[PDB]
Structures are given as C-alpha cells and as structure tokens.
RNA sequence: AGCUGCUCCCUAGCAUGCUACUACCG
RNA sequence: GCGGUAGUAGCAUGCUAGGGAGCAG
C-alpha cells in the first residue's frame, strides 16, 4: 500500500523468500537526529540508546533501490561508533581505568538489527 | 547549504527566547512568524532577507556583548 | 582473576593431583585429591564471585557518576555556549549583507526597530559620530544592510530636527551625537 | 549472629575437638569430633540462617508500614486542602439576588449558564481588533445581557494599563492588541 | 500537563528450574 | 557403592517491581 501509519512498504527478499517490510520517511529520522530538547542529544555521548532505537526504525532503508537511503543507515552506525569511542576516551581520563565489560560493540554490527525483522520470537 | 541557514535561524530564535523576549507580545509574535516562514522557505535569497530581518531584533537590545563574541 | 590467595591453594591442589595422576598411584590417595581439590574450587569461587560482584558495582557506579556530572555541567552554560555557537554559525554562513550590519553593530549602528523589506516602510537607525555618518550617510541615499535607503528625518539626542547640510566634521563637535536617522528603501 | 546457644555449643565442641586432635588419639576420637562439624552445626545452620531472615522480614514490614503511613498522611493533607478550597470558593457569592432567582424556580433547579450571566458582579471582555472594540464597549459605559455595565481599568496582552484616550483608530498599531476590558455591574 | 499500542536498554526482587560440589540419614 | 534429608556456588527460565528512551494514532 502507498502509505499506512506514515510508513511505506517494500517487498524485500529476506533469504530464501520475499517479505513485506515497512520503511519510514527518512527526513523524519534525520530531523529526530538533529533537533531535541536541551540536554537530550546535546552531548549525546550519554544517550546512545536514542540512536540505537532510531537506527532500529531505519533499518529497512538498507534494502532500498535508491542510494542515499541506505547511506542514512550507515551514517547512524558510524555515528554510534564514534560516539562510544570518544565516550570511553573521556571516561578514562575522568578516572584512570576504563570499564571492565561494555558489551556495547554489538550495537554497531548490522546483524543485531536484522533480528528485529524475522518471524521467530 | 540551505540547511545551514535554517538551523541558524533555529539557534537564533532560541537565543532570543533565552533573552526573555517574549515579554512583549507584538515583538515575540513577529519573531515567531518570521522564524516559521523561514523554515518553510524554498528559495535561496528570500531566506537571507528574512534572516537579517530577524537578526536585527537581537541587535536591538544590549544584552549580548557583541564585541566580546567577535573575538573570532 | 589469578593473583588471589585462594588461587594459590587451588593451584597447589591442582598441581598435586597432576603429579598424582601422572604417577598413577593408588585410589585411596586420590580420595584426598578429590576431597581436597573440590574444596579448593569451593573455597575459591566463593571468593572470585564475591570480588566479581564488587567489580560490577564499581562500573555501574562510575558509569552513573560520570553522566550525572556532565549533565549538570551542560545545564550550567546554555546562555553562553549558545551565543558563541550562534556566532560561529554566522561567520561560517558568510553573507556580506549580514557581516555588514554585524560590523556596523560592533561599531554602533544599532537599529531601533525591525529592518523592513517593503519598498516603502520606514527605518530608524542610530549613529554615534561623524565618520560613521561619512562612512554611511552619503547625500540623501543611505547604504545599510547592503541596501539603499532614502534619508528623510535626521534628529539628534535633543530630539530636535537638524539640517542635513549642517552635518560635517568642522561643526560636528556641536551635536547631540546619538543621531537617529530615518529612511525608506528603494 | 554472635550471642547464641548454638555458638557456645560450637565453641565447646571445637575446643574438645582441638584438645583430642592435638592428642591425636583414638579413631573414636575422630568419630566423636567429626560429629561436631556434622551435628553441632545443624542447629548452627538453622538458627544462624533463620534468624538472618527474621531481621529481613521484620525490616521490610517496617518499611512498608512507613510507606503506608506517609501515604495516608498525604491523603489527609490533600483532603484538608480541597475542603479549604471548597469552603473559600462559596465565600464570594451569597448575594440575596441569587437566593431570589432560586426562589423563582418552580422546583429549585436552574440551568448553570444563566447563573453568572444574570448574577455576576463583574464582567471581562476580550477584544481583538479596533473596529470590533468600536462596535461594543465604546464609550465609558455600555449595555450587555439586558444590563448596564460601566468600564473601569483596561489592560493589554502584556498586562499593562492603558487609558481610553489612546484607543484611537490610528494609534491602535501601537499596542499588544487583544485587549482585556473589565467592567462593573452598574445599577 | 492526555488516552492507548508496540520496542529497546538498565536495575532490583521473588520464585521456579537446573547444575554441580560441601554437610546429615539411609 | 547407591537412595532420602541439609550447603554452596553456578546456570537456565519466567514473573514481578522499578527506572531510561524512541515510534505509530
């Protein structure tokens, strides 16, 4: 369908078969990235989860025929990575020993997002 | 490029707000109206006209030491 | 985890069992090496786990205190960082129209009202001194905001109309210098 | 977790154990002194673990009763507040004319909308534009709702006073322009 | 300064379940 | 050498509660 709850639909080959997936309107996502309410996002080096969820919403743009779309996804990824990096750098100086186990690296690998669209949960 | 001037407008309006400019309904109304129109503007030049038209408002009062910020 | 005291005991028991199962000795001797090594694992994890919990508490405390600090940090400096970011974006944006009035205002050319755009419509600016005027007021056309304005009603701080022609460096040291100029666009 | 009848049994059994172990005597010695870490500590398992749960449960009971107490406190506070609000609200209205129009009801029930319309003691009107003002509370007194109202005290959006003189046709583009006019019930 | 709905993350707690080794009886 | 009752630490599930954030109408 052309549009529903402000989502577009796209038929993508997920492995062996074909499935309908909803991708949003990129401008909306970008805007949500750029404009916020003070402390939020401003110094987002404490707010990564915002971007986690946002990327979740913007995954299907990966499978898209047109170009810049998937570039939005990769942009969010690399931004998350830079965020965590410059975060750890500050936290090290703040004290003198980085954290023991972050386990946050999974957040910037694509597969974890893909899991959010597959019939087994 | 136009994104630059738009975001600039946003920041500037936020500043005006911080300066308590909303204590005069006429002024605040003109400002908000200008800012809105900017954000919907789709040419390159009319944007700048409205932009300077706005910025004048900040130029009015003497709360923002201009020379100090002009330290480059 | 390694340098722990209980790890010394666990290491001793493990090495002793290693030597015993290497020599392939009796069964009655390992009855200790089992009842003396199981305990090592017992008297050992019941302390590697306990320090481990503290080792997670340290994290989930530091990772909180950090953001708690930089939070109130950023909610201390808005009406300061905001302005400098603004002017940074200005300088980067680069529009001669703007820079003109911005420099003018570093000088003193403060407008007492909104800059209009209608071909008619009035404009009221301020001028501190002579050269400002000479650098700006040229005949009866006014060049402001990189725009052409028609000079119509000069008046000094005594709120009295003053003759345009009278304005010149010679007799200027006699004027209520905050001059209020009014004009209209082209 | 220190002064218990199980602790003393532990201490004395362990003392006899140390004694007859430094003796290093019989196998019956080993039996009767392993029946110590094996029989004199079951009591020390129970009463030195059960008694650890008694404290936990008593203290959570204490904290929940604290929370319930503070809760019911807030209840009393808010009900006092709203009672005060009610009692102070009515203390501004009991003009006899209200009672009068009540007595005129065939039943004693009247539609709400007409109570303040007829019985209020002060009217406030909000005006957008000049022509509109002209077509209503122009002049120093006017009429409305079959009654006579007199103007006094007029403010603006910025909530600053303004006199009737300034309200010209061409001075109007100089004001926060949706004015508030407060008028009084003239007899 | 709302009504819902979905989603992620963090934390606690309970209980289960399970694991095993340590202690009592068969 | 097995079976039943007591510990430990670990693991799994789940359930509750608590807290943060985002999207849709």
UniProtKB/Swiss-Prot annotation, chain A:
Its required cofactor(s), as named, are: Mg(2+)
Q: What does its activity-regulation comment describe?
A: Inhibited by Remdesivir antiviral drug (GS-5734) through non-obligate RNA chain termination.
Name the domain of life this protein comes from.
Viruses
Catalyzed reaction equations: RNA(n) + a ribonucleoside 5'-triphosphate = RNA(n+1) + diphosphate; a 5'-end diphospho-ribonucleoside in mRNA + GTP + H(+) = a 5'-end (5'-triphosphoguanosine)-ribonucleoside in mRNA + diphosphate
Quaternary data: Interacts with nsp7 and nsp8 to form the replication-transcription complex (RTC): nsp12, nsp7, two subunits of nsp8, and up to two subunits of nsp13. Interacts with nsp9.
The protein's role, per its UniProt record: RNA-directed RNA polymerase that catalyzes the transcription of viral genomic and subgenomic RNAs. Acts in complex with nsp7 and nsp8 to transcribe both the minus and positive strands of genomic RNA. The kinase-like NiRAN domain of NSP12 attaches one or more nucleotides to the amino terminus of NSP9, forming a covalent RNA-protein intermediate that serves as transcription/replication primer.
Name the UniProt record assigns to this protein: RNA-directed RNA polymerase nsp12
Organism the protein comes from: Severe acute respiratory syndrome coronavirus 2
* Lineage of the species this protein comes from: Viruses, Riboviria, Orthornavirae, Pisuviricota, Pisoniviricetes
Q: Which gene encodes it?
A: rep
Range within the parent protein: 5201 to 5321 of 7096
Swiss-Prot record, chain D:
Residue windows of the LRR repeats? 30-57
In what residue span(s) does the RdRp Nsp8 cofactor domain sit? 1-187
Q: Which domain of life is it from?
A: Viruses
Q: Where in the cell is it found?
A: Host cytoplasm, Host perinuclear region; Host cytoplasm; Host endoplasmic reticulum
Q: What is the effect of changing residue 113 to S?
A: In strain: Omicron/BA.2.75
Q: Where is this region: Disordered?
A: 1-73
Subunit structure of this chain's protein: Interacts with nsp7, nsp13 and nsp12 to form the replication-transcription complex (RTC): nsp12, nsp7, two subunits of nsp8, and up to two subunits of nsp13. Eight copies of nsp7 and eight copies of nsp8 assemble to form a heterohexadecamer dsRNA-encircling ring structure.
Q: Describe the task this protein carries out.
A: Plays a role in viral RNA synthesis. Forms a hexadecamer with nsp7 (8 subunits of each) that may participate in viral replication by acting as a primase. Alternatively, may synthesize substantially longer products than oligonucleotide primers. Interacts with ribosome signal recognition particle RNA (SRP). Together with NSP9, suppress protein integration into the cell membrane, thereby disrupting host immune defenses.
Protein name, entry field: Non-structural protein 8
């Amino acid at each position: 369908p052309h549009e529903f709850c402000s989502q577009h639909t796209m038929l993508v080959k997920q492995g062996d078969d074909y499935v309908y997936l909803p991708y949003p309107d990129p401008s909306r996502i970008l805007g949500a990235g750029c404009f916020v309410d003070d402390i939020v996002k401003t110094d987002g080096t404490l707010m990564i989860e915002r971007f986690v969820s946002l990327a979740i919403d913007a995954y299907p743009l990966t499978k898209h025929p047109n170009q810049e779309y998937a570039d939005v996804f990769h942009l969010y990824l690399q931004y998350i990575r830079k965020l965590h990096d410059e975060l750890t750098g500050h936290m090290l100086d703040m004290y003198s020993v980085m954290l023991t186990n972050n386990n946050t690296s999974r957040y910037w690998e694509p597969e974890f997002y893909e899991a959010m669209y597959t019939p087994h949960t | 490029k136009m994104s630059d001037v738009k975001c600039t407008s946003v920041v500037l309006l936020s500043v005006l707000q911080q300066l308590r400019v909303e204590s005069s309904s006429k002024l605040w109304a003109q400002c908000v109206q200008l800012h809105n129109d900017i954000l919907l503007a789709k040419d390159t030049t009319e944007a700048f006209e409205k932009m300077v038209s706005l910025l004048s408002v900040l130029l009015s009062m003497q709360g923002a030491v201009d020379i100090n910020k002009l330290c480059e | 985890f390694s340098s722990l005291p209980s790890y010394a005991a666990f290491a001793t028991a493990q090495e002793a069992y290693e030597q015993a199962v290497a020599n392939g000795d009796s069964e009655v001797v390992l009855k200790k090496l089992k009842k003396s090594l199981n305990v090592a694992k017992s008297e050992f994890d019941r302390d590697a786990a306990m320090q481990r919990k503290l080792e997670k508490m340290a994290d989930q405390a530091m990772t909180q205190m950090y953001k708690q600090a930089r939070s109130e940090d950023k909610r201390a400096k808005v009406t300061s960082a905001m302005q400098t970011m603004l002017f940074t974006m200005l300088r980067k944006l680069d529009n001669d129209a703007l820079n003109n009035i911005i420099n003018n205002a570093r000088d003193g050319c403060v407008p007492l009202n909104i800059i209009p755009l209608t071909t008619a419509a009035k404009l009221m600016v301020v001028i501190p001194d002579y050269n400002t005027y000479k650098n700006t007021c040229d005949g009866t056309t006014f060049t402001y905001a990189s725009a052409l304005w028609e000079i119509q009603q000069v008046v000094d701080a005594d709120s009295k109309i003053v003759q345009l022609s009278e304005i010149s460096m010679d007799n200027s040291p006699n004027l209520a210098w905050p001059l209020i100029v009014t004009a209209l666009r082209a």
